[PDB]
Symmetry: C2
Subunit: 329 residues, 2 copies
């Protein structure tokens, strides 16, 4: 009671977030793309309808909130978010920050200028909507580019001024979180304010416990990603990899068994439309995981329960950890 988080429909009590998926998207796109070329997705109406059905399905499985980690450059459409949140009765936390596809107008900016843009989206509102970001999303794909270092310092500073958490995209195989952490700490950012994402893309538990031990949240946020059975498909194969969902899910238990239950955030990195990759990737995806954002509570949570993870532990991971993370601190 007392603490609040911003969602696309206004403020909610922290305690009403409930079961929360911390890394999800309604639509993975590009800035301006959904406005310029809605037919790519059939129509905007078709997109919203598919998102509403998907989200009601997650709601029926026990999902109360998702964090849509779409930034500016993932083509975040906060009006679409508001519309489907409202229609499906699922809270949606919107993001600021920048992913790894920023245009020249962002790439030419300084750390001061980025900080001011992130603070705008958190404090003033996204665009002209008054809808406020509840999270800052950042990305590296390997060693940070010079511009990526600016983004990470500007994220740290935005967070320090507002108490809003930071969440990252990594190449997990390249152990990006270790540099991400060094950059954030050089800015005085508490590791409890930070989630290192796509961390289930690796089984390097030396890497993952090293981060957990320092206080970072470890985002095991790609649960249904697997190209097993589709090795013919080279694009599915590079995106989803060759590890099963059970292998990914085993990581949750491995971290719990090593004393890190409070450092884990679980999610799907699911979407309902997807323009920033090959055409029809969304059909491929929907065949791999027809349960969409219900896969975690239908499949992953019972799998953990059956392996002996206590229900209080599982509640801590899916409710307490998100609440503590999203709570402005």
């Amino acid at each position: 009671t007392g603490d609040l988080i911003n969602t696309v429909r206004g403020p909610i009590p922290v305690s009403e977030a409930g079961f929360t998926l911390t890394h999800e998207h309604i639509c993975g796109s590009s800035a301006g793309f959904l406005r310029a070329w809605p037919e790519f997705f059939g129509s905007r109406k078709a997109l919203a309808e598919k998102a509403v059905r998907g989200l009601r399905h997650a709601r029926a499985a026990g999902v109360q909130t998702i964090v849509d980690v779409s930034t500016f450059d993932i083509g975040r459409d906060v009006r679409l978010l508001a519309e489907v949140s409202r229609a499906a009765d699922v809270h949606i936390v919107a993001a600021t920050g920048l992913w790894f596809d920023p245009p020249l107008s962002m790439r030419m900016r300084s750390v001061e200028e980025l900080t001011q843009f992130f603070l705008r989206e958190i404090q003033h509102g996204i665009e002209d909507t008054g809808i406020r970001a509840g999270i800052i999303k950042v990305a590296t794909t390997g060693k940070a580019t010079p511009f990526q270092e600016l983004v990470l310092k500007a994220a740290a500073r935005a967070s320090l001024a507002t108490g809003v958490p930071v969440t990252t995209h990594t190449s997990a195989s390249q152990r990006d979180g270790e540099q991400q952490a060094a950059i954030f700490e050089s800015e005085g950012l508490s590791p409890s304010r930070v989630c290192i994402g796509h961390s289930d893309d690796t089984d390097d538990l030396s890497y993952l416990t090293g981060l957990a031990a320092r206080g970072y949240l470890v985002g095991l946020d790609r649960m249904p990603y697997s190209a097993i059975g589709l090795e013919g498909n080279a694009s599915a194969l590079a995106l989803f990899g060759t590890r099963s969902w059970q292998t990914r899910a085993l990581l949750i238990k491995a971290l719990i068994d090593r004393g890190y239950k409070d450092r884990i955030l679980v999610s799907h990195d699911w979407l309902f439309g997807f323009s920033s990759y090959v055409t029809n990737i969304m059909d491929v995806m929907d065949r791999i995981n027809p349960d969409g954002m219900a896969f975690v509570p239908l499949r992953v949570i019972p799998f953990l329960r059956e392996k002996g993870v206590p229900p209080e532990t599982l509640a801590g991971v899916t409710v307490a950890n998100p609440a503590r993370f999203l709570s402005p601190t």
Copy 2:
């Protein structure tokens, strides 16, 4: 009489275009940027006001029409175009196509998919506005990337289906127009439908007459660009180069004197806001050329007249050539 061109305010007779600047921008930005971060430009109201004052100044110097060659990825805001066109009483032709900053949602597309996007903007309307593009803008910066080859073939096909001309950004020093031409001709596109832009960035008249001789329009469209007196400024220096406006203007005469008066299009590549380069480049620019889009008729046209170019010739370059070019053919 009879032929029409689309502008941001609806169709106009070809014959009312009059003195037309064929490569200009209201604002050089990025897709979504003006909506997400209007304060970068002071405000959107300040931006529109500066554009209206600039355009009325061009109107007073005899300018009746500009072609705003901002694409999707230059952050083209067709509503802003319509607003300032209307307020300044200057026609504005909007563009489709893609420049050299496309996001992943565009970079992952095929030639078929791009053709369908360009045709949408020409035939249906940009976004949800019903405002139709009158030109397709494409870009290389050296040898075409694989994606740039798709853009050029999709531009050629869009043009062939609609009769709308194509205009290009080149690195003139690298003689890009020669590959651009080969790609367009491989698609059956008539050279009379094509303008090779930034061609005044080079004094290689072998390169330029070679193109003119094949029927291309040669875009001498950077007239006021000069960093002379600002060699201290490394960003101004790389963008504007070390050649005077008189040197650039001499090219117009050189092509006329070689029998190519009908192949020349003249312009400034001016803007009223500019986010896709260093901060305050617009202040630097406005000090170099306080006349903005009036520089050509105030400075360039009298300079040519005083060097002995006949007024009928000069009218042919600034009125007849644009009309013939923009006229869907």
